[PDB]
Amino acid sequence: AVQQNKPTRSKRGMRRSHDALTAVTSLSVDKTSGEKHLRHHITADGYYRGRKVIA
Amino acid sequence: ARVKRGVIARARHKKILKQAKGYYGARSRVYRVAFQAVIKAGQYAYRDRRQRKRQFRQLWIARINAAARQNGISYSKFINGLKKASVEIDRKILADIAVFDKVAFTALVEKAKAALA
Amino acid sequence: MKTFTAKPETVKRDWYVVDATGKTLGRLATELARRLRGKHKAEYTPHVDTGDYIIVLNADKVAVTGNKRTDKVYYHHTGHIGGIKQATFEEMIARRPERVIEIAVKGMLPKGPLGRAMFRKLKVYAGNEHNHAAQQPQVLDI
Amino acid sequence: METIAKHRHARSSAQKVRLVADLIRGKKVSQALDILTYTNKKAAVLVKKVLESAIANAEHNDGADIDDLKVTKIFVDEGPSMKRIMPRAKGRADRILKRTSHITVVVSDR
Amino acid sequence: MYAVFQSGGKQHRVSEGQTVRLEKLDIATGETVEFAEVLMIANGEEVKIGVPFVDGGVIKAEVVAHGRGEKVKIVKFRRRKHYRKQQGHRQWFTDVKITGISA
Amino acid sequence: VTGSGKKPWRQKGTGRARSGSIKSPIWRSGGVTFAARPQDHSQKVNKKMYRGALKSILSELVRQDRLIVVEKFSVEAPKTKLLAQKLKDMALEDVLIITGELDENLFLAARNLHKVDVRDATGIDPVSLIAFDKVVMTADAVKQVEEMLA
RNA sequence: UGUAACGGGGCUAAACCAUGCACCGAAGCUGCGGCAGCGACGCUUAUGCGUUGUUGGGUAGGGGAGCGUUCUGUAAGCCUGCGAAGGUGUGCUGUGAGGCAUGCUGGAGGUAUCAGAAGUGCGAAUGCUGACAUAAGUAACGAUAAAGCGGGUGAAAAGCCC
RNA sequence: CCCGGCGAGGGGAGUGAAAAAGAACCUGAAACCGUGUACGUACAAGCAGUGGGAGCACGCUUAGGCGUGUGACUGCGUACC
Question: Which GO terms describe its molecular function (chain E)?
Answer without folding.
Answer: rRNA binding; structural constituent of ribosome
